[PDB]
């Protein structure tokens, strides 16, 4: 009845705990609709509306996210809940319904079950930034 | 002359703390911290110069390298040599400058008089 | 009483860079000529079975110009960890 | 007389208060770890100090 996952985007880490329950899904002490950009509301429910509400009716997810930036953290909760409903369907449900969940979530966004390896490079001397440099003058 | 609604008589006769209180916070910072040996010495020598002075004539020139030394009201009327670093220069203490540093009266430098530029 | 000095001979002294460069300095300090002594240390450490070596003496050799002499023998590696 | 004024000053701070522990120079000192050497002598000895260049 219990399954645990983690989302990753850049330095932002999410942790999703799935128990059998009424379908309550909360993030670090508040529902999906209290999150900071409200503009970014719809990216959070994307797997939800994709997966259907029926499959979330029997799943209670408590989500703990710290690290990174504001925007990154919503990608983190996205990741957490998606990876959660795929990794829970493996253990406590069959592989057919996990294949249904996965075929629905994959063709929309590949970032649902995978993370972007990419993270900030190192600024080096001789410039203000990773590549970018200081001006030079002849004459 | 008036400083904070207070004249030269009261200033001289006032205790050192009541002298301190009317100066700005900057003078208060260096005073409340105390004044040092090499300064109390110059204070004492300008006392002996002002005390030995003739009836109508101003006290003997006391030369000094202390620019950083604040002007007490007790130096009023006293001739202070201030070191500019080349030459001892001639300062005559008036009542208005009792808040200022001895130094600024001695200029640091010869004022720039420009002339035509040259090849570079 | 908390310090104890123990001297131990370096086993192959040709294959020590510090040792034979030291003897190179010392031998040039002998008033010995540049070419003969350097070819000696080179031929010695080479013979010691070390895959390769190079010797470079730079400074005043002949006169007031600035000379750098370089004798190279066998394999040599430079770049890389 | 002269014994009072030879070292007359509170040099407990400043640039001239500090010297490299090899070459006796006060220019460009590394004060971080209690290194107390100017940059050049630090760069000369880094091996034995155990500063390896990994980057």
């Amino acid at each position: 009845q219990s399954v645990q996952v983690f989302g990753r985007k850049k330095t932002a880490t999410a942790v999703a705990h799935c128990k059998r329950g009424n379908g309550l899904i909360k993030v670090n002490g508040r529902p999906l609709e209290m999150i900071e950009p409200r503009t970014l509301q719809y990216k959070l429910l994307e797997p939800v509306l994709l997966l259907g509400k029926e499959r979330f009716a029997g799943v209670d997810i408590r989500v703990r996210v710290k690290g990174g930036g504001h925007v990154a953290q919503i990608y983190a909760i996205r990741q957490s809940i998606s990876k959660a409903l795929v990794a829970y369907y493996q253990k406590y449900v069959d592989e057919a319904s996990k294949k249904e969940i996965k075929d629905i979530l994959i063709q929309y966004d590949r970032t649902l079950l995978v993370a972007d390896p990419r993270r900030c490079e190192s600024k080096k001397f001789g410039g203000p930034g990773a590549r970018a440099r200081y001006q030079k003058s002849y004459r | 002359f008036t400083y904070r609604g207070v004249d030269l008589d009261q200033l001289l006769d006032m205790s050192y703390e009541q002298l301190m209180q009317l100066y700005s916070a900057r003078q208060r910072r260096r005073l409340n911290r105390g004044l040092r040996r090499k300064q109390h010495s110059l204070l004492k020598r300008l006392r002996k110069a002002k005390k030995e002075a003739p009836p109508m004539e101003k006290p003997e020139v006391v030369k000094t390298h202390l620019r950083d030394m604040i002007i007490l009201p007790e130096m009023v009327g006293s001739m202070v040599g201030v070191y500019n670093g080349k030459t001892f220069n001639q300062v005559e203490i008036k009542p208005e400058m009792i808040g200022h540093y001895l130094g600024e009266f001695s200029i640091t430098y010869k004022p720039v008089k420009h002339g035509r530029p040259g090849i570079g | 009483g908390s310090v104890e000095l123990y001297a131990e001979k370096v086993a192959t002294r040709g294959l020590c860079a510090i040792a034979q460069a030291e003897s190179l300095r010392y031998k040039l300090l002998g008033g010995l000529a540049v070419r003969r002594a350097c070819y000696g240390v080179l031929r010695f450490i080479m013979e010691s079975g070390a895959k390769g070596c190079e010797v470079v003496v730079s400074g005043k050799l002949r006169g007031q110009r600035a000379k750098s002499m370089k004798f190279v023998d066998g394999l040599m590696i430079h770049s890389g960890d | 007389g002269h014994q009072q004024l030879y070292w007359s000053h509170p040099r407990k701070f400043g640039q001239g208060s500090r010297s490299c522990r090899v070459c006796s120079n006060r220019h460009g000192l590394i004060r971080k770890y209690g290194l107390n050497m100017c940059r050049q002598c630090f760069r000369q000895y880094a091996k034995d100090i155990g500063f390896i260049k990994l980057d």
Binding site: - | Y3, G5, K94, E96, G99, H100, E104, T108 | - | -
Partner: protein, 143 residues
């Protein structure tokens, strides 16, 4: 919304011409001796609302704001809100307005010119007095 019939298009306070179709605090700011900050103090003291444009105010509100600004220390306008905290001669706390500000400037120039000090020499030759580096900059306005 409103449609005020009595509105002063041109106002006069303390020798200065005030524009009242502007907002209130930022109209009062126009005069010397007042910024937005001290304006908010005086207008929060006089009980005058900040929502009104400066032309809707009755003569009683303009006269009580004037009365507040002439006499700073009576109205509980904090001693650190005063332009000149302790003046050199009388030793008093006074809030300096347009003509008085300009005059105090002129005078504090004259004192330093008669005294023969460095601040004043600086202010005399047309140099920046704060010890700025005058090599590179401090050009514009010169021949």
């Amino acid at each position: 919304l409103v449609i005020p019939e009595k509105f002063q298009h041109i106002l006069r306070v303390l020798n200065t011409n005030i524009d009242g179709r502007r907002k209130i605090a930022f109209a009062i700011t126009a005069i010397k001796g007042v910024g937005r900050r001290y304006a908010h103090v005086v207008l929060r003291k006089a009980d005058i609302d900040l929502t009104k444009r400066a032309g809707e105010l009755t003569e009683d509100e303009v006269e009580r704001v004037i009365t507040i600004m002439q006499n700073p220390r009576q109205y509980k306008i904090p001693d650190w809100f005063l332009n000149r905290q302790k003046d050199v001669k009388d030793g008093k706390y006074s809030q300096v307005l347009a003509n008085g500000l300009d005059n105090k400037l002129r005078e504090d120039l004259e004192r330093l010119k008669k005294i023969r000090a460095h601040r004043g020499l600086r202010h005399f030759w047309g140099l920046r007095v704060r010890g700025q580096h005058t090599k590179t900059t401090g050009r514009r306005g010169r021949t």
